[PDB]
Design a protein around this ligand. Sequence first.
Ligand SMILES: COc1cc(Br)ccc1CO
Ligand SMILES: COc1cc(Br)ccc1CO
Ligand SMILES: COc1cc(Br)ccc1CO
Ligand SMILES: COc1cc(Br)ccc1CO
Ligand SMILES: COc1cc(Br)ccc1CO
Lengths: 302, 262
Amino acid sequence: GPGSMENFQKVEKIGEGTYGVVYKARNKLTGEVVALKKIRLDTETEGVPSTAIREISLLKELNHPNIVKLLDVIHTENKLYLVFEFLHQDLKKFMDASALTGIPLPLIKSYLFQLLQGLAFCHSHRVLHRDLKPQNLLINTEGAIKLADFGLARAFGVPVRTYTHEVVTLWYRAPEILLGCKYYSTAVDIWSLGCIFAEMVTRRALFPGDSEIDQLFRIFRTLGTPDEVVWPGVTSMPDYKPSFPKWARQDFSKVVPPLDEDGRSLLSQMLHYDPNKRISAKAALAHPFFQDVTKPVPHLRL
Amino acid sequence: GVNEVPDYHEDIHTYLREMEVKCKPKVGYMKKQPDITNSMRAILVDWLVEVGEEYKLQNETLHLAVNYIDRFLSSMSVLRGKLQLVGTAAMLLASKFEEIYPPEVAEFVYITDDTYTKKQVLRMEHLVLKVLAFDLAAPTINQFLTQYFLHQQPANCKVESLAMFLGELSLIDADPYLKYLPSVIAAAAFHLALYTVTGQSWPESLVQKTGYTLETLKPCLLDLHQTYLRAPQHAQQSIREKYKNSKYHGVSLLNPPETLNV
Ligand SMILES: COc1cc(Br)ccc1CO
Ligand SMILES: COc1cc(Br)ccc1CO
Ligand SMILES: COc1cc(Br)ccc1CO
Ligand SMILES: COc1cc(Br)ccc1CO
Ligand SMILES: COc1cc(Br)ccc1CO
């Protein structure tokens, strides 16, 4: 691409992944702050990691304001550098930063609505993220949140085929993955966004499981244990057990008590057991919860 | 339901339609290839079909790899002793993109009979990614076929498998199929598969979705009809061997129709 390491001045470390390390850097000719993701291909006896092949190929097509911008790839034999636009913070670190203050309803609402736009755009370009969690959502000082970390993402066909089952960080994982379903679709990213909506309101994770079955049992204790009525086919599902405790569904008002009627409607549709009945990111944009949406700047210094 | 992404299927189809044009190889690249021929490419692709059967890889992976190869050969002049290195690197990249469990790099070295070293494979891997600028999410014939398959009333597994098979036959012959886009070959393959098994024809639902009609499809259909008729005698035979399997409903044993009433 049209980039070279000599024009970047490193600033500090800002992150780390299996790939390697993420650095804030500065372009010495343009002034542009970037994030530099380094991939080590030297430790790679199997060539370019499949995670990186997917991340680059997919991020190259996904030009959208609520998806992080891959500006460039510097491609030597020993190393691969991913040049990304620089955003100051993740949503996880900001929720912790709002621990005692609370996150303001207008920011919760502008964040959910921009997350729903970037998801809708990923889904409209045959891409599933499969790791939507606050840690992978990047905010800036102007009021934007963007989807990032596309290393677990996948280009899908229509209808879907069977893909990797080891998918989505546990607390954000959808039941159909937990229940070993042959097929999963765009509804898994919505499940994750619904968990995130709740987390923005409470600043705590909605389903904090220590195991797959604890995750399942915590979802079932909050939302009730699904039967053939609410979710046709559930009892036939591979990892469904007849012995599973049959918890009643509590009033959804008690799942996230400070949520208003509109918030609750939308959280309910994002957390519907049946992936077929679960709301699309496209449809969710028209939800009454967003009639008064604005894009405020974040209320804390980042 | 959601497995057929009802809220996104049209946006997706429109998007692939745009991307298939961007991912298209040069129709006339072999004339500019001084050392390799259509006959050699057919040998490579037929080998890749056998390799996909050996490692039990998806058909999608085969299609991707062929796309990568043709796009690569559209800009990079290649000696015949290296054509299999390009092909191996294409199938490795395709595998890492599309497969849950890609074969290991050592497995790709092994299938080449130690013609090449692991170091040669990994370096071509890098070269292909550089030549293709990491654009690997290319529309395939399959991505079109699976959407078209939703317009069957009702679904017929013989029709699905035969269209898959006909589309695969097209990968073998750069002449003429380099001249047709994945969406068009898929349409031809589907209509030809539907007639052979049910006697039915390209549906209006798909005219509505695609804008394509049997008149717009006539050129590829005539070419595909001939390929189907001539397939038992083609020098490459690996796709017919593959489509005898029960996985594919033994569709390679179905008789092609003598005429198309076009
Ligand atoms: C900023 O420039 C960089 C950045 C990283 Br990370 C590694 C090497 C260089 C060379 O200058
Ligand atoms: C890839 O990781 C990123 C990217 C950006 Br932009 C900003 C911060 C981080 C944290 O590591
Ligand atoms: C109306 O104000 C709200 C509402 C909810 Br729900 C969550 C946070 C705030 C502001 O800290
Ligand atoms: C006016 O804007 C609205 C109104 C309703 Br109701 C629902 C969603 C939006 C999106 O912004
Ligand atoms: C070594 O023979 C070849 C060459 C090419 Br190109 C493709 C396939 C084969 C068969 O293994």
